[PDB]
Amino acid sequence: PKIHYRKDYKPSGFIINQVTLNINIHDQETIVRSVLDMDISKHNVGEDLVFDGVGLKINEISINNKKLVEGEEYTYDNEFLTIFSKFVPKSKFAFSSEVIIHPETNYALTGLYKSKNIIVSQCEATGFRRITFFIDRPDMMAKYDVTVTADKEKYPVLLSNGDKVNEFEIPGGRHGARFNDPPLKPCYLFAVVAGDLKHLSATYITKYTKKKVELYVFSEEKYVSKLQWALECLKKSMAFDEDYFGLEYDLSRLNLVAVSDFNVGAMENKGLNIFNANSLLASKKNSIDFSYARILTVVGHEYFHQYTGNRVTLRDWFQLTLKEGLTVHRENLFSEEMTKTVTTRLSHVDLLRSVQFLEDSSPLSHPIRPESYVSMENFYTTTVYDKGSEVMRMYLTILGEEYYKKGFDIYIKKNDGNTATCEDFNYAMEQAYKMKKADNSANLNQYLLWFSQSGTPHVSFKYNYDAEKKQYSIHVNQYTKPDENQKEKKPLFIPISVGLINPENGKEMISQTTLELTKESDTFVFNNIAVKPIPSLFRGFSAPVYIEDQLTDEERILLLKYDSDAFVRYNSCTNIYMKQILMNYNEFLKAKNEKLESFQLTPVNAQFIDAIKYLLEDPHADAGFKSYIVSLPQDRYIINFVSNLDTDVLADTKEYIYKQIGDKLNDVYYKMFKSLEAKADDLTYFNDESHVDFDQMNMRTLRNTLLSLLSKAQYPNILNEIIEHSKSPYPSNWLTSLSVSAYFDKYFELYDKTYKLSKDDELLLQEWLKTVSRSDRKDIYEILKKLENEVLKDSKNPNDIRAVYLPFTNNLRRFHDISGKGYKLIAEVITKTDKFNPMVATQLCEPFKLWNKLDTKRQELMLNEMNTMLQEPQISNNLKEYLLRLTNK
């Protein structure tokens, strides 16, 4: 089990200049012939030539067309091919090999594998070595000349990177295609696709150079009608990169391909992007609303990788955030501009502060640039991606749009043909920073700590107002808790976007201001402040931090009603909810601990409830924003604020708070649900495949949120609305009708009805499975068994497995059953999945991430299941490393 250390980076003693591949696909095997045109680098010290090569069946290997002999001249251990130094040439040489691989039984979905009737590769991070021998690391840049051959009938469409330069018939019903890709690329960006693929296509003309680019979107025949939105999103992505960044696509064709079996969302293979079908395919009849935003983001993300990942690549895998953080940030800017709704920003923050904050306070805590790994596939994390994105977004906040665009352009121009590190990006931003500050002594050396320091900073505030002086002071403190990565934490460069609200009229008292906190603490003073303001802090969520605003509930209610910034309003609401949750939780817990026969609970603040009503009745307020305010914070956000969290107590706490609010607002909720129907469910453009209205979709989100609240509340005659909702043409509506019926005797009636609606579309079925899995059912364990026996069976499709099990793990009451049966269920699935797909087994561990934050009993139950999993004889390297890290061993 080799540990790879960031500090150990060294260039290779070898060069690979040219790759010539012949991939011959047959019924029971795939034959891969490869010639590597190689050289000795300046860094060479006479070492053995070692190729990565995992699970390859060697037919023959040669050096300069001379066949090598096993044992005497080389050894192979199924992982590494070692050719002894004395047999390696001292100048330019050819290494050739012929290996057998077996895509049909490749269930790990890495390297070359079969997805239904499509042969497809996945090479990032370490999958190319599963196809053929290579020095499988991103700094080994080479040209690629690739020929794919297969049965014409089964595999009429053949795709790889670069220009298709030849097509030819082969005897015995076969055919071939040659693809030459002269520009240098790393091997993780190699891809091949073979299948009976149908397509839509368009032509895009670039903004400045007026180049014609052919756009092709591919899928299985059955689902080709679902490709239209993806095509629109691709065009949008190209336009945005041209409009915001002045960046044009450089190649003559871009292919997007949907496959049914995929470990993640998608993959940015150069000119040949490959997608989880759930992230490319959609129709209004057969997709939930969420699919539309998801496709926009995933197509966007993959397109933006062309510059940030593909043209400027990574020196090494420790630089992963350089492409992932930066590309997520580019996708975020894009989606905000396309959706024109505040919920795009709000949703990313909602994800970061629940999922990523949990990761950063867990034993798995790491910086966005890790210092080490065993399995690189374990580091494609919410921290590297989503905290990386916030670190990338902070540059823009600090610089402003103009100077940010200037620094980004410096980065692209300086690094376009080559590999890069995180320091290269910081360097480019510093050039922009020197220009903005108007002095070349200014630097961003301190900013580099965002790359190296793990843990979430806590930012706290104290205030002072002098009425006589018209002087307002904001004292700010920053603190990161010690963890296993750094004993001593250092102050970070924290941008704090601030406004000051006049509480008398709700108006801005100052111009836009970003406070630059660069020390452990600082005091920021403002003159000519005419009245005591309410501070609007971290506008836009301006730094990835715990915000401790120290405001009263009165001050927070005023910001919630009157502030201009959507995040501060959402956060004020969040903070009001958290104070209430912590109070009522401690009250419930004391009553439990002290075995009380009677006790008191503190009611929900009545003026807060009045503020929610005000906001909901406001015609101008965003429907998506409205759905957040009626929803309590995520369980995974809350757990960061409670030691030894008793999940039953938290469940009782949420239940009380929801009941308190609904007791006052249920009539308002029902009135809104009915009044929103017309615009939310409008069918005017249902048969327009390209017409996508994010406001309307947020209106449905609100209606369905309200319906959920009313069904839990058992509002009079609400089952009538549920039954009518099940007759909606929109899957977001009729699948919601399934989940909300959980509280009524008609649940299995709607189970059968919605299954029949879902069963003939692969992706829709997986959405039905998620809805069943997340259903608030007392018999949920019996239902999951029904799902296993009747639908899931022995599927190895990650979409199916994840859909059956993951949503269930958010069932606070039932997943965390005190018997440990929920934990045993998921561990069994993890262990079973690990035998064929280590990556997905690793994904299925997500529920265990908070194990040491729970009450004593549940802590012991989870740890027991994790120790049981670690004891498994055949455990993967991926799963073993992940669980060892998570359990602090």
Q: How far is the CB of 296 from Mg ion (least distance, A)?
A: 9
Nearer to Mg ion, 278 or 580 (CB): 278
**104 a known binding residue?**
no
Q: How far is the CB of 420 from Zn ion (least distance, A)?
A: 15
**266 a known binding residue?**
yes
Other CB atoms within a 10 A radius of the CB of residue 724 amount to: 12
125 binds, among Zn ion, ligand BEY, Mg ion, none (CB under 5 to 8 A by kind): ligand BEY
- Site mask for ligand BEY (CB under 6 A), range 331-370, x = bound: x---------------------------------------
Q: How far is the CB of 624 from Mg ion (least distance, A)?
A: 12
Q: Which of 183, 265, 363, 506 is close enough to bind ligand BEY by CB under 6 A? A: 265
Interface positions, 327-366, toward Mg ion (CB under 5 A) = 348
Distance CA 623, CA 836 (A): 43
Q: Which of 255, 297, 339, 696 is close enough to bind ligand BEY by CB under 6 A? A: 297
Distance CA 689, CA 283 (A): 7
Distance CA 877, CA 468 (A): 67
Segment interacting with ligand BEY (CB under 6 A) among 71-79, 262-270, 453-461, 760-768:
262-270
Q: Does 239 bind Mg ion (CB under 5 A)?
A: yes
**Pairing state of beta strands 212-220 and 197-205?**
antiparallel
φ, ψ at 288 (rounded to 5°)? -70, 155
For residue 289, give the amino acid letter: D
Interface positions, 322-341, toward Zn ion (CB under 5 A) = 324, 327
Tokens of 778: 């007392």
Distance CA 604, CA 614 (A): 16
Residue nearest to Mg ion (CB): 55
- Site mask for ligand BEY (CB under 6 A), range 94-123, x = bound: ----------------------------x-
Q: Which of 30, 219, 237, 263 is close enough to bind ligand BEY by CB under 6 A? A: 263
Q: Which of 357, 380, 395, 747 is close enough to bind ligand BEY by CB under 6 A? A: 380
Nearer to Zn ion, 321 or 876 (CB): 321
Segment interacting with ligand BEY (CB under 6 A) among 11-19, 261-269, 471-479, 765-773:
261-269
**400 a known binding residue?**
no
Q: Does 267 bind ligand BEY (CB under 6 A)?
A: yes
Closest CA to 112 of 277, 273, 120: 120
Say if CB 256 and CB 242 are below 8 A apart: no
For residue 470, give the DSSP letter: T
Say if CB 599 and CB 591 are below 8 A apart: yes
φ, ψ at 504 (rounded to 5°)? -70, -35
User: Partners of 70 in the beta sheet?
Assistant: 74
Burial readout 63-77 (b: 16 or more C-beta within 10 A, e: otherwise) = beeeebeeeebbebe
Q: Which residues contact 755 (CB under 8 A, 6 or more apart)?
A: 768
Say if CB 292 and CB 284 are below 8 A apart: no
Segment interacting with Mg ion (CB under 5 A) among 239-247, 414-422, 662-670, 812-820:
239-247
Q: How far is the CB of 368 from ligand BEY (least distance, A)?
A: 14
Q: How far is the CB of 238 from Mg ion (least distance, A)?
A: 8
Length of the chain: 889
Q: How far is the CB of 27 from Mg ion (least distance, A)?
A: 16
Nearer to ligand BEY, 192 or 264 (CB): 264
Tokens of 795: 């599927």
Q: Which of 130, 284, 301, 858 is close enough to bind ligand BEY by CB under 6 A? A: 301
Distance CA 505, CA 363 (A): 47
Distance CA 244, CA 405 (A): 8
Q: Which of 15, 32, 118, 125 is close enough to bind ligand BEY by CB under 6 A? A: 125
302 is catalytic: yes
**268 a known binding residue?**
yes
Active-site position among 220, 232, 302, 430: 302
Q: Does 265 bind Mg ion (CB under 5 A)?
A: no
How far does Cα 506 stand from its chain's mean position? 37
Q: Which of 18, 40, 50, 55 is close enough to bind Mg ion by CB under 5 A? A: 55
Q: Does 377 bind ligand BEY (CB under 6 A)?
A: yes
Say if CB 113 and CB 106 are below 8 A apart: yes
φ, ψ at 463 (rounded to 5°)? -130, 160
Q: HSE, CB side, 13 Å, CA atoms: give it for residue 216.
A: 16
Sign of CA dihedral 278, 280, 281, 285: positive
Q: How far is the CB of 90 from Zn ion (least distance, A)?
A: 40
124 binds, among Zn ion, ligand BEY, Mg ion, none (CB under 5 to 8 A by kind): ligand BEY
Torsion of CA 419, 421, 425, 428, to 10 degrees: -70
298 binds, among Mg ion, Zn ion, ligand BEY, none (CB under 5 to 8 A by kind): ligand BEY
- Site mask for Zn ion (CB under 5 A), range 306-325, x = bound: ------------------x-
Burial class for 494, CB neighbours closer than 10 Å (0-12, 13-18, 19+): buried
Residue with tokens 């008793």: 646
**822 a known binding residue?**
no
φ, ψ at 634 (rounded to 5°)? -55, 140
**CA geometry: angle 829, 831, 833, nearest 5 deg:** 65
377 binds, among ligand BEY, Mg ion, Zn ion, none (CB under 5 to 8 A by kind): ligand BEY
**265 a known binding residue?**
yes
**248 a known binding residue?**
no
The site for Zn ion (CB under 5 A) is made up of: 324, 327
The site for ligand BEY (CB under 6 A) is made up of: 122, 124-125, 263-268, 297-298, 301-302, 324, 331, 377, 380
Query: Residues at the annotated binding site?
Result: 124, 265-266, 268, 301, 305, 324
Annotated catalytic residues are 302
Query: Residues at the annotated binding site for a peptide?
Result: 124, 265-266, 268
Query: Residues at the annotated binding site for Zn(2+)?
Result: 301, 305, 324
